[PDB]
Amino acid sequence: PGSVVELLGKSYPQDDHSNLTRKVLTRVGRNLHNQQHHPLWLIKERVKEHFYKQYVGRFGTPLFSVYDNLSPVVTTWQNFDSLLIPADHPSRKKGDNYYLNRTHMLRAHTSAHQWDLLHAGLDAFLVVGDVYRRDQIDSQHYPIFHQLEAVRLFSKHELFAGIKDGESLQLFEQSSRSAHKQETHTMEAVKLVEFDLKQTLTRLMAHLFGDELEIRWVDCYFPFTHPSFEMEINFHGEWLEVLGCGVMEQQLVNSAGAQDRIGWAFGLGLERLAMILYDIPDIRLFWCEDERFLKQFCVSNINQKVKFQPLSKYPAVINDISFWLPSENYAENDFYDLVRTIGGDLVEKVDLIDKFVHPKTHKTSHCYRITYRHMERTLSQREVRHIHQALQEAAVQLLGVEGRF
Numbered sequence: 001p002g003s004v005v006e007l008l009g010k011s012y013p014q015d016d017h018s019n020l021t022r023k024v025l026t027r028v029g030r031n032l033h034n035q036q037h038h039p040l041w042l043i044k045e046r047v048k049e050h051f052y053k054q055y056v057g058r059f060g061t062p063l064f065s066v067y068d069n070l071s072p073v074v075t076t077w078q079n080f081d082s083l084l085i086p087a088d089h090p091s092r093k094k095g096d097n098y099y100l101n102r103t104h105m106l107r108a109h110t111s112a113h114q115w116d117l118l119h120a121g122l123d124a125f126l127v128v129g130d131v132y133r134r135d136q137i138d139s140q141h142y143p144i145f146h147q148l149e150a151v152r153l154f155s156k157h158e159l160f161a162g163i164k165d166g167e168s169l170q171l172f173e174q175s176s177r178s179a180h181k182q183e184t185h186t187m188e189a190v191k192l193v194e195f196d197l198k199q200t201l202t203r204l205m206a207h208l209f210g211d212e213l214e215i216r217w218v219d220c221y222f223p224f225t226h227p228s229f230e231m232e233i234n235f236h237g238e239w240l241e242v243l244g245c246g247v248m249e250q251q252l253v254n255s256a257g258a259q260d261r262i263g264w265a266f267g268l269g270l271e272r273l274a275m276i277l278y279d280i281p282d283i284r285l286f287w288c289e290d291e292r293f294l295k296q297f298c299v300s301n302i303n304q305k306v307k308f309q310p311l312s313k314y315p316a317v318i319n320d321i322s323f324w325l326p327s328e329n330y331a332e333n334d335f336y337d338l339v340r341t342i343g344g345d346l347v348e349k350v351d352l353i354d355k356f357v358h359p360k361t362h363k364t365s366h367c368y369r370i371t372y373r374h375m376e377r378t379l380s381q382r383e384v385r386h387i388h389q390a391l392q393e394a395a396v397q398l399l400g401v402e403g404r405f
C-alpha cells in the first residue's frame, strides 16, 4: 500500500480504488509479445504476415496498421465507458481489475484502444499488448496475458461494391434491435459485415493451424458489439473459446468520428491460441526463462513450423490453508494476489474447497487447497513448507484473516 504509485515514469495518487500489487508492477513493460523468438511474439508475427499477404493478395483487403507498443496504463473511460460498458457492470469490480486509482488502470483488454485509434481516422488496425486482470489461479489463468485486437471499417459503397444496384442499398435504417442486428443497422449491411468477419477469422485460423482444425461459432454478448460471437476450437476433446468478436456498436463508431462507417472487431487471446497451437500445458511457461522451453521457438523464419516438445512434469506438493475472514472485509482475489506474491510461479493452482459460518462467532471460514508444482524442477517438501508458512503469516498480516489452519 501507499500514497503514490510510480509506473513507467509517471506518478498516480492513490485512493479507495487503488489495488495494484508490486508483483504485477515488476511485469509491466516486459512486453513478451515484442520479444524476438518468444512464442507470443511468434503468433503476433504470423498474424501480421497473414494480414499483410491478404492486403497484397486481395484488392478489397485494407492495409492494417499495427500498434504493439501502447502503454497498458489507460483511463476507466478508455477501458470501459468508450466501449459502452454500464456503470454497474460486473466487469468493473475492484475485485477483477488492477486500478491505479479511480481514473487510471492497467487495461483489462486491448479493446481499450478501439475508440482512440478510430478517433484518429484509421479504417483498419491491429493492437497487440499485455492486458491485466485479477482472477483465479490455475494452469490457464495468469494476472497478465496478451491479446490481439483487430478493427475493420466499411463504407457503404465499399461494402456493396460487388452488387449491381448496390448503391441503392444502405448501411443504416431505423428499426428495432433483434438477436441478429442493432437498431440502426440494415440486415443487408450486417449480413455482409458478419460474413466478412467470420471469413477473415476462419482464413487466419487456417493460416495458423492448417485446414484441419475443428472450429465453431457460439453466439454471445459484449456491450461494444452486436451481433457478437466467440470462436471455439476443439482441442484435446474439448471446445475452447479463443476469441470474442462482433459487429461494432454504432454508438461507439459514431462517437469516435466515423459516423459513415460500419465495422467489425475481434480480440484474440494469444496465450490461449499459443497453448493450443504448440500444445503448451501451463501458462506459467510463457514467463519462465528455461532454455528447454524458449530454445524451441527460435526459428529461422516465422513460417518454420515449431514442433514443441513438452518438458517433463515434476511432482507437486499439496497443502491446505484455512482461516477466518475479517469481519466484513475480504475478497477471494485478494488472497490470490498474495499467493502470486509469495508463491510466485511455484504455485500451480488454488482451490477454495470449503467455506462455512460459525454460529457463535458469526465468522466465515475459508479453506484453500494449494498445489505447488514447479514447471522446471522437483520441489522439495522443505522449500514448500517455508513458502507455505510465509503465506500463512502474510495472510494474517495483510488480509486480516485469523489463522485457523
Ligand SMILES: Nc1ncnc2c1ncn2[C@@H]1O[C@H](COP(=O)(O)OC(=O)[C@@H](N)Cc2ccccc2)[C@@H](O)[C@H]1O
Pocket (backbone or CB within 6 Å): 108, 109, 110, 111, 135, 140, 141, 142, 143, 145, 222, 224, 225, 230, 240, 241, 242, 243, 244, 245, 246, 265, 266, 267, 268, 269, 271, 272, 283
Ligand atoms: N488469464 C487468462 N489467460 C489466458 N486466456 C484467458 C484468460 N482469461 C480468459 N482467457 C480466454 O480469453 C477468451 C476471452 O477474453 P475475454 O477477456 O473473455 O474477452 C475480451 O477480452 C474482449 N475484449 C474481446 C473482444 C474484443 C473486441 C470485440 C469484441 C470482444 C476467453 O473466452 C477465455 O477462454
Ligand SMILES: [Mg+2]
Pocket (backbone or CB within 6 Å): 230, 242, 243, 244, 245, 267
Ligand atoms: Mg473474448
